[PDB]
């Protein structure tokens, strides 16, 4: 029977619902990640008859049995909004105004971007990100280095023993998207390109709609827990309404095949 | 019901019903503080006189 | 079957209400608001039969209960200072008139007021207010008396010169105005047609400047009358719960 | 769908914005040139229920929406610095000071330095437009009501003036947008800028040595966020009972 597949389709939808909220809710001291929110569509509709003639003399209502089918989860979309600044003190991490994105080399040879900024020196001297992916335009930290200096624009300098003027020691370009909301993520706080996406475009902060780089802070998360308790009220309401229409049809099932 | 209402013309209406006093149903001036005494005598001040 | 229709109303009824207290508990804190309450009247009765001494043994079943409307007190709120200069507070009755986008005029009570580009006095929305006073620049000071006159200082000046009046409506029947969203209000034929006058004059209120009109919403009476529909709410559905029961054990048998 | 619970959310909402701004006026309160914040709140759009010349019509509420945040442009109070090249304010005005990139940035908060080159800067390395440049060999820095600034030598009487420091005015101040280090930028909101002399076309004077300090009234914070706390508190309550109603509801 019919309804219980519509009920089935509604269950569904509202699981992957509180899927999405749990994941919120989860990773909310998570650095730099964007929320996410699940936007459903209706399915197809079987017009089991057209309606007729009317409004001739009369007003009776228009006699058309049009059935419904249920609901799917038609997308998923992250709001790339501006999160908080928390301090750390830690002079290897930028947190970033505006929109951007770092880029990181992924081992197999492609590339990706991300919004966490905290970043660690290995052993040869290179900047990578908590996980050991080479910052794509690699900056080199030298050795006996008294103190590393990363101005709002992507200059990065640090200050030898004896000479008086800091050396420059590289640039911290940051690439932009066409659609920021059309990334496809994956682990460790990665996005890669897809269609959806324009080609990814890099610039110096502050220039083509890049943003800046403060030192020593790291962008917060920004999930609204507020939100998310109603949400979660409200799916487990709607996924209690869902099953009970689902024992209505059960019980009246029951009751045809005691015929 | 004692929910009495004000029309646009100054009628005491009950849900559409005008109230009935004595000697004719009821009339009040245009934008009155309306003030009921305790025995039914309905006070009218007009607004910003004294 | 008529009992499930008449529990139906009635729990209508009941969400509507609970409607309306959350509407009011939700903006407590908009300036120039004013709580709303809901009024329920009965519906048609079905006279079933025509009624020593004994009962008169007449039978008129009801039909059950909906919402006819929601009243409006458009009493006078606490005023909380801003310090701000181009805020202003109504004394008694009256409303600022402002202009929309499309042409018509609208009606507003809560004063937060900011000015454009051109200098023109405007809301905090981009509407104009209709008496069209403009502020010039380079203004030392702005002042907005208990009339409706507002005034600039200017350098070197011995008096201010005055830049326009800030004159208000009244309307005949407050409660009626509809209200549209965006802290504003609309002329209907519930209202009577507006008229404008000077502040402090014809019934009109009075001005004071640097103050605003705080909502009057009474946080105890909700929270009572909340408690009343929840309680109410349960006790309909005891009526489904057993009309259910009768009808199953009637189609069983 | 219940109706009642996207009310209380908006609700809640809006108490945590106020919050927010609460917070951010109470967290910068020793910053120097610092405007107060408050927000504005207004309610959703209404739904009319039809009936079959009524007192009144039938309408039914959303929520609530915050609209806008305005800051208070008032005169805040003067600290003396004992400084030499701070500056204060007395009325209204605002210095103008080039972003790297090339654009002009406006502000108001006072306490310059000079850079290696000898030149007048902001703390933060940006360099005040009409580039005031002082020489070394600098016995004192005199900077008067006007703009002018000037810089006493070693065995000369006469000062040598070497720049004004003009101001710009807007037809309104709090239409200018924000952005970190207390820099504002133009607007269509905010009329385009006109330089002027201190003290003329309604521009403020200058005071040597002092620093304007922050509009925040710290006695109304601590009440408005009593207000918040138990608005929140009460919006919470609204969330609990509309979730007890709908769950007796469903075990019918």
Same mark, same amino acid.
């Given at each position: 029977?019919?309804?219980?597949?519509?009920?089935?389709?509604?269950?569904?939808?509202?699981?992957?619902?509180?899927?999405?909220?749990?994941?919120?809710?989860?990773?909310?001291?998570?650095?730099?990640?964007?929320?996410?929110?699940?936007?459903?569509?209706?399915?197809?509709?079987?017009?089991?008859?057209?309606?007729?003639?009317?409004?001739?003399?009369?007003?009776?209502?228009?006699?058309?049995?049009?059935?419904?089918?249920?609901?799917?989860?038609?997308?998923?979309?992250?709001?790339?909004?501006?999160?908080?600044?928390?301090?750390?003190?830690?002079?290897?991490?930028?947190?970033?105004?505006?929109?951007?994105?770092?880029?990181?080399?992924?081992?197999?040879?492609?590339?990706?971007?991300? /919004? $966490? !900024?905290?970043?660690? *020196?290995? %052993?040869? &001297? #290179?900047?990578?990100?908590?996980?050991?992916? =080479?910052?794509?335009?690699?900056?080199?930290?030298?050795?006996?280095?008294?103190?590393?200096?990363?101005? /709002? $624009? !992507?200059?990065?300098? *640090?200050? %030898?023993? &004896? #000479?008086?003027?800091?050396?420059?020691?590289? =640039?911290?370009?940051?690439?932009?998207?066409?659609?920021?909301?059309?990334?496809?993520?994956?682990?460790?706080?990665?996005?890669?390109?897809?269609?959806?996406?324009?080609?990814?475009?890099?610039?110096?902060?502050?220039?083509?709609?890049?943003?800046?780089?403060?030192?020593?802070?790291?962008?917060?998360?920004?999930?609204?827990?507020?939100?998310?308790?109603?949400?979660?009220?409200?799916?487990?309401?709607?996924?209690?309404?869902?099953?009970?229409?689902?024992?209505?049809?059960?019980?009246?099932?029951?009751?045809?095949?005691?015929? | 019901?004692?929910?009495?209402?004000?029309?646009?013309?100054?009628?005491?209406?009950?849900?559409?019903?005008?109230?009935?006093?004595?000697?004719?149903?009821?009339?009040?001036?245009?934008?009155?503080?309306?003030?009921?005494?305790?025995?039914?005598?309905?006070?009218?001040?007009?607004?910003?006189?004294?």
């Amino acid at each position: 029977i019919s309804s219980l597949w519509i009920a089935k389709t509604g269950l569904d939808a509202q699981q992957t619902n509180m899927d999405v909220i749990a994941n919120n809710l989860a990773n909310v001291s998570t650095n730099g990640f964007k929320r996410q929110r699940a936007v459903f569509e209706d399915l197809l509709y079987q017009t089991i008859r057209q309606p007729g003639a009317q409004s001739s003399e009369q007003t009776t209502l228009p006699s058309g049995l049009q059935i419904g089918t249920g609901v799917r989860p038609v997308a998923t979309e992250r709001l790339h909004s501006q999160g908080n600044l928390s301090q750390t003190n830690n002079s290897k991490d930028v947190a970033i105004k505006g929109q951007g994105f770092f880029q990181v080399m992924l081992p197999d040879g492609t590339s990706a971007y991300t /919004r $966490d !900024g905290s970043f660690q *020196v290995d %052993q040869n &001297g #290179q900047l990578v990100t908590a996980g050991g992916f =080479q910052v794509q335009p690699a900056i080199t930290i030298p050795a006996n280095a008294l103190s590393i200096t990363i101005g /709002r $624009d !992507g200059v990065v300098s *640090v200050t %030898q023993q &004896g #000479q008086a003027a800091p050396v420059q020691v590289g =640039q911290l370009n940051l690439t932009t998207f066409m659609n920021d909301t059309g990334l496809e993520s994956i682990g460790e706080n990665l996005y890669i390109e897809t269609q959806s996406s324009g080609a990814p475009n890099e610039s110096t902060p502050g220039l083509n709609g890049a943003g800046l780089l403060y030192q020593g802070y790291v962008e917060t998360s920004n999930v609204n827990v507020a939100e998310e308790l109603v949400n979660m009220i409200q799916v487990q309401r709607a996924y209690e309404i869902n099953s009970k229409a689902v024992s209505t049809t059960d019980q009246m099932l029951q009751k045809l095949t005691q015929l | 019901n004692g929910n009495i209402q004000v029309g646009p013309t100054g009628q005491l209406t009950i849900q559409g019903h005008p109230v009935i006093g004595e000697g004719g149903p009821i009339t009040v001036p245009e934008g009155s503080e309306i003030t009921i005494a305790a025995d039914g005598t309905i006070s009218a001040l007009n607004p910003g006189d004294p």
